[PDB]
Amino acid sequence: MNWIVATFMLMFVLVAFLPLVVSLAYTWVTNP
Amino acid sequence: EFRTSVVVSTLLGLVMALLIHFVVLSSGAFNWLRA
Amino acid sequence: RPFEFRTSVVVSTLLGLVMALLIHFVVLSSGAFNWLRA
Amino acid sequence: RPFEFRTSVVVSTLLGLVMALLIHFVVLSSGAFNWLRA
Amino acid sequence: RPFEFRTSVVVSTLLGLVMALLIHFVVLSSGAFNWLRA
Amino acid sequence: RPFEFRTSVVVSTLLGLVMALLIHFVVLSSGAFNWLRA
Amino acid sequence: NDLVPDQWKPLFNNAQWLVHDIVVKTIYGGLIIAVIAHVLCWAWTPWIR
Amino acid sequence: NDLVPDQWKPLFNNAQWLVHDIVVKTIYGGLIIAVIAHVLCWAWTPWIR
Amino acid sequence: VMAVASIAIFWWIFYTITPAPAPPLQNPIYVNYTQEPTDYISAESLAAMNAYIQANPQPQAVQVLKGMTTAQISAYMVAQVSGGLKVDCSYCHNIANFAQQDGYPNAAKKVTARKMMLMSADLNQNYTAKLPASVGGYQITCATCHNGKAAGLEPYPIEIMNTLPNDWRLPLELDYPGGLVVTGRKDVSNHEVEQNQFAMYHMNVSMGQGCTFCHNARYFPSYEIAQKNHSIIMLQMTKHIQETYVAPGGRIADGIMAGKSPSCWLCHQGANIPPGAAKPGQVPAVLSSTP
Amino acid sequence: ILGYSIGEIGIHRVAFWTGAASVLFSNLCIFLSGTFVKDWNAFWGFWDKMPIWNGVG
Ligand code: BCL
Ligand code: BCL
Numbered sequence A: 001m002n003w004i005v006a007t008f009m010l011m012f013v014l015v016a017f018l019p020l021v022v023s024l025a026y027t028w029v030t031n032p
Numbered sequence B: 001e002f003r004t005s006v007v008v009s010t011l012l013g014l015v016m017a018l019l020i021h022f023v024v025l026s027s028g029a030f031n032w033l034r035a
Numbered sequence C, D, E, F: 001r002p003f004e005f006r007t008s009v010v011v012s013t014l015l016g017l018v019m020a021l022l023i024h025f026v027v028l029s030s031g032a033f034n035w036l037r038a
Numbered sequence G, H: 001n002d003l004v005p006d007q008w009k010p011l012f013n014n015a016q017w018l019v020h021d022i023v024v025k026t027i028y029g030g031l032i033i034a035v036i037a038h039v040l041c042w043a044w045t046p047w048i049r
Numbered sequence I: 001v002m003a004v005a006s007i008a009i010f011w012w013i014f015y016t017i018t019p020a021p022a023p024p025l026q027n028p029i030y031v032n033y034t035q036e037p038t039d040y041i042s043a044e045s046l047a048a049m050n051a052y053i054q055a056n057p058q059p060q061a062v063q064v065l066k067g068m069t070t071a072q073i074s075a076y077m078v079a080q081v082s083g084g085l086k087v088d089c090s091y092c093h094n095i096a097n098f099a100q101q102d103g104y105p106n107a108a109k110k111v112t113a114r115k116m117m118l119m120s121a122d123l124n125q126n127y128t129a130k131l132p133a134s135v136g137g138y139q140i141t142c143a144t145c146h147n148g149k150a151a152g153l154e155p156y157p158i159e160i161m162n163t164l165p166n167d168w169r170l171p172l173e174l175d176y177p178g179g180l181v182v183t184g185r186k187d188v189s190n191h192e193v194e195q196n197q198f199a200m201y202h203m204n205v206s207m208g209q210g211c212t213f214c215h216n217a218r219y220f221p222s223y224e225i226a227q228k229n230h231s232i233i234m235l236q237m238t239k240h241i242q243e244t245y246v247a248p249g250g251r252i253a254d255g256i257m258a259g260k261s262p263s264c265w266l267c268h269q270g271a272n273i274p275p276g277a278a279k280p281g282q283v284p285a286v287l288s289s290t291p
Numbered sequence J: 001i002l003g004y005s006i007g008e009i010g011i012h013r014v015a016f017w018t019g020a021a022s023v024l025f026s027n028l029c030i031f032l033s034g035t036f037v038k039d040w041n042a043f044w045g046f047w048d049k050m051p052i053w054n055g056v057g
């Protein structure tokens, strides 16, 4: 109940974190 | 990329094994390590 | 190289060391073995 | 060629020193040996 | 050529000094020797 | 050329000054000598 | 080069092969010692009970 | 990159293929051990009850 | 889908293995503390008690507890006196003639117990009758301040006071109608504010709830929550306890309690309406607020 | 001054990254405070009892 939904919302917070990492790794790769 | 798949796979598997091992230990329902 | 060999050995030795340390600390703090005055 | 030798010796002597220090601290603070007024 | 001698002496004289200082502070603070009003 | 002399004298006088200062602070704060109203 | 067998030729360089060998030997020795230590920790006091 | 079969040729390089073999073998072994361990944890004390 | 499936498997695992949630302890008298296993009360003593109840109608030579029968007295003693302290039944009683002290029937304890009874009655009558409606009629008794322990209780344990300095204690030598106020005073500096925040965090850990329990953090000098008035009464009560009973003219002279300040935590023990506090109607008339 | 020059392309990357990271850590902290942590002083209670120094006092 409370904890299932809480974990699922924490998933979304980490997904918000996600794009910045893709930016960093793209810069690392495409700049040899 | 294949390596992204294997990286995320191991990480998720390791985290999941660790979380299940912690939950089962802390539940106190198995008489394991003085319980 | 689909995987640089040295990346594998680095991550292997780090994971192994962390895992040994964590297990050791859990076993010591459980207090179920009578080791170092217990 | 796959590994620089000096990186190995550097990491080895750092890990060994840290490990000796940590074990020495833990054993001293456990208070189970009667060493330095205990 | 690979291993610079001066790096060795620098790290040696730093580690030795730190180690002497740490041991001197631990022994003083243990209060087991009756040294400087103890 | 391998060892600049002035680096040696700089580090020597810095270490000596710091060490004299630290020892005088420790001795003063120990309160075991009856020096400056103690 | 060319010291590694043909089946693993596309993966391993020459130098990477000897390190590997060292790694495998160390892992085998460590596993043997781990098994012995576990048998000893069991004979002392069992943990499952 | 011609060691992989034709059906999977667009996807896999040559080097990727062998690591993929290693991964499949490891996964099969792990699944067998996992099944054995669960049968044992069940015979000990069942969890559903 | 692998992620959500794994999360579902994990939660099923957890629900299955996890031991069930706990129901709150229900005891007819106390709010959250029970005395259930009476093995600590010896059994030969319990047999002798029945005799004294059945033999005599009224208790000979009771100084306090004036409107009770021997049976009521005995039941009250086994339920709250022996129950609060978890002592032996003979811990301050003799087998017979236990009205007075003869032959050291664990002498010098019965009189301290009588004085504790008096002090509890006085606290209950002077301070615990304030804004009674909507607060409840809970009343202080033996289980409070003792929590199943005869002696050696600690008003400041080590677990609380993680952030505070260990030398620190609640400052009870102040008028406390508003003596701790600090806002906008212009004759106090950051040192006074630091002492204030120490005391406030202590009140925070004592009470189960958070810091907005009684403050309305937009303006701290405001009194709109009305859970502060209760705190003013409790503060005057704690100061009165310390000044009158812990150290009346020095701990050595005419002091009981062995010089232990009340500390606001040994009563509440991590929750408002402390668990040792008796429910309304479960305390002798003399000991209660309305006698 | 300080013995390092980041370059023209370097400073703009760093600006973008720091700006983006601040708000992410912030929203994590608030969501966590609401759901799992009641007070923050109790969180740091574990540090004192770290084995290395739990008995030296
Ligand atoms: C007695 C049984 C206990 C129990 C406790 C556990 C514990 C503890 C674990 C599981 C885990 C698993 N359990 Mg269970 N399990 C129970 C009840 C259940 C029930 C149920 C009643 O319905 C179900 C459906 C499951 C289902 C599952 C699977 C989903 C999962 C393992 C499969 C896997 O991923 O592949 C197989 C396993 C792998 C992940 C792949 C193999 C990887 C290789 C082998 C890595 C090993 C390398 C090794 C660590 C290092 C080697 C040394 C080198 C020298 C460095 N469990 C009861 C409560 N369960 C395991 C897990 O993985 O959780 C994800 C886990 O550890
Ligand atoms: C007494 C029994 C305790 C317990 C206490 C421990 C402790 C403590 C440890 C383990 C460790 C392990 N335990 Mg156990 N363990 C218990 C119950 C179990 C159970 C169970 C019943 O289900 C299982 C499955 C395991 C399984 C395992 C493995 C996961 C792991 C080591 C396997 C291996 O060989 O290492 C894999 C291979 C190696 C480690 C290679 C070693 C490499 C070289 C040899 C290291 C040398 C280090 C050297 C000193 C450094 C200086 C060298 C320089 C050259 C000088 N344990 C009970 C609870 N277990 C060990 C761990 O994993 O740490 C890593 C660990 O320390």
Ligand code: BCL
Residues within 6 Å of the ligand: D016, D017, D019, D020, D021, D023, D024, D027
């Ligand atoms: C009294 C027994 C205490 C205990 C107290 C300690 C303490 C304390 C220590 C160890 C250390 C070790 N212990 Mg023990 N240990 C105990 C029980 C155990 C048990 C067990 C029963 O299971 C095990 C397996 C171990 C195993 C070990 C190894 C992991 C480790 C050292 C191995 C080695 O030779 O060093 C590997 C090789 C070396 C260290 C190379 C040394 C290099 C050179 C010689 C260092 C010289 C330093 C010099 C002074 C600097 C100045 C020189 C300049 C030239 C002047 N201990 C019990 C609890 N143990 C030691 C540790 O690891 O620290 C490193 C450590 O200090």
Ligand code: BCL
Residues within 6 Å of the ligand: E016, E017, E019, E020, E021, E023, E024, E027
């Ligand atoms: C009284 C006993 C106390 C104790 C108190 C101390 C104190 C205090 C010290 C040590 C130090 C040391 N102790 Mg001890 N030590 C104890 C128990 C032990 C035990 C144990 C039983 O297990 C061990 C193994 C050791 C081992 C050691 C070595 C690790 C170390 C010095 C070794 C060496 O020769 O120096 C290595 C070589 C040298 C230091 C080279 C010296 C270089 C030159 C000579 C320095 C000259 C300085 C000069 C004054 C500067 C001006 C000169 C200008 C030219 C004018 N001690 C007990 C607890 N021990 C010493 C330390 O390490 O500090 C360095 C330290 O000060």
Ligand code: BCL
Residues within 6 Å of the ligand: F016, F019, F020, F021, F023, F024, F027
């Ligand atoms: C009273 C005894 C106190 C104590 C108090 C102090 C104090 C205080 C000091 C020392 C200092 C020293 N002590 Mg002692 N010390 C004690 C016990 C000990 C013990 C012990 C029993 O084990 C030891 C081994 C030592 C050993 C030492 C040396 C490590 C050190 C100085 C050695 C040296 O000659 O200087 C090395 C060589 C020199 C310092 C060169 C000096 C250079 C020139 C002469 C400096 C001139 C400065 C001038 C004023 C600046 C203006 C000049 C312009 C031209 C005008 N002490 C007890 C606890 N000890 C001194 C320290 O190290 O400070 C440096 C320090 O001040």
Ligand code: BCL
Residues within 6 Å of the ligand: C009, C010, C012, C013, C014, C016, C017, C020, C021, C024, C027, C028, C033, C035, D008, D009, D011, D012, D023, G030, G033, G034, G035, G037, G038, G041
């Ligand atoms: C609780 C009951 C027993 C206990 C039960 C067990 C059991 C059971 C086991 C151990 C194991 C070990 N225990 Mg124990 N252990 C006890 C108490 C102790 C005590 C002590 C304080 O008393 C000590 C010091 C130890 C120490 C150890 C080590 C000897 C060993 C773990 C090896 C490992 O983890 O490293 C592995 C580290 C890594 C994987 C990396 C190693 C790093 C390499 C060697 C350094 C070179 C690196 C190279 C330069 C490349 C650099 C790479 C960089 C990282 C990038 N135990 C108690 C008494 N212990 C385990 C062991 O022996 O198996 C071998 C074992 O199975």
Ligand code: BCL
Residues within 6 Å of the ligand: B006, B007, B009, B010, B011, B012, B013, B014, B017, B018, B021, B024, B030, B032, C008, C011, C012, C023, H030, H031, H033, H034, H035, H037, H038, H041
């Ligand atoms: C509660 C009752 C039982 C219990 C019930 C079970 C059950 C049931 C199961 C386990 C499982 C396992 N248990 Mg258990 N377990 C118990 C107590 C223990 C104890 C101990 C302290 O007592 C230990 C050490 C273990 C340990 C383990 C491992 C042997 C195993 C989990 C494998 C896994 O998670 O890793 C998987 C890790 C990953 C997925 C990644 C592995 C990393 C690879 C191998 C390293 C190489 C990486 C490579 C270089 C690429 C690098 C990639 C980078 C990461 C990016 N259990 C108790 C006694 N346990 C599970 C298992 O055996 O299934 C295999 C199983 O199903």
Ligand code: BCL
Residues within 6 Å of the ligand: J022, J023, J026, J027, J029, J030
């Ligand atoms: C006693 C109170 C606590 C406190 C409690 C909180 C709480 C509670 C929070 C913060 C949060 C923040 N606090 Mg704080 N904070 C305190 C003390 C401080 C101190 C200081 C020096 O003491 C500082 C620097 C900060 C700094 C900050 C950052 C950590 C963070 C900023 C919010 C933000 O970036 O996202 C805010 C982002 C948005 C909401 C902006 C959304 C805007 C949308 C997209 C635009 C709408 C368009 C709008 C209509 C305009 C239209 C344009 C047309 C022209 C009209 N706090 C005190 C100690 N702090 C907040 C945070 O974590 O962020 C989640 C928060 O939750």
Ligand code: HEM
Residues within 6 Å of the ligand: I081, I084, I109, I112, I113, I114, I116, I117, I120, I140, I141, I142, I144, I145, I146, I150, I151, I152, I153, I257, I258, I260
């Ligand atoms: C019941 C209302 C009640 C009784 C009865 C009672 C008795 C009692 C005794 C016998 C002691 C002394 C035990 C010893 O061997 O010395 C004692 C001591 C303390 N008490 Fe008490 N007490 C009763 C009630 C209360 C209440 C409500 C409080 C709360 C303030 C309280 C407090 C104390 C304190 C403090 C002590 C001293 C503990 C120590 O360490 O010295 N009592 N009580």
Ligand SMILES: CC(C)=CCC\C(C)=C/C=C\C(C)=C\C=C\C(C)=C\C=C\C=C(C)\C=C\C=C(C)\C=C\C1=C(C)C(=O)CCC1(C)C
Residues within 6 Å of the ligand: E017, E020, E021, E024, E025, F009, F012, F013, F014, F015, F016, F017, F019, F022, F023, F026
């Ligand atoms: C708290 C506790 C108990 C700690 C325990 C651990 C302890 C106490 C010690 C541990 C280690 C020790 C003993 C360190 C000691 C270091 C010393 C003494 C360094 C040298 C000083 C000698 C010095 C600086 C001499 C320097 C040379 C100088 C000043 C020359 C200056 C000059 C310069 C450079 C010029 O332009 C020309 C003029 C002139 C030549 C005079």
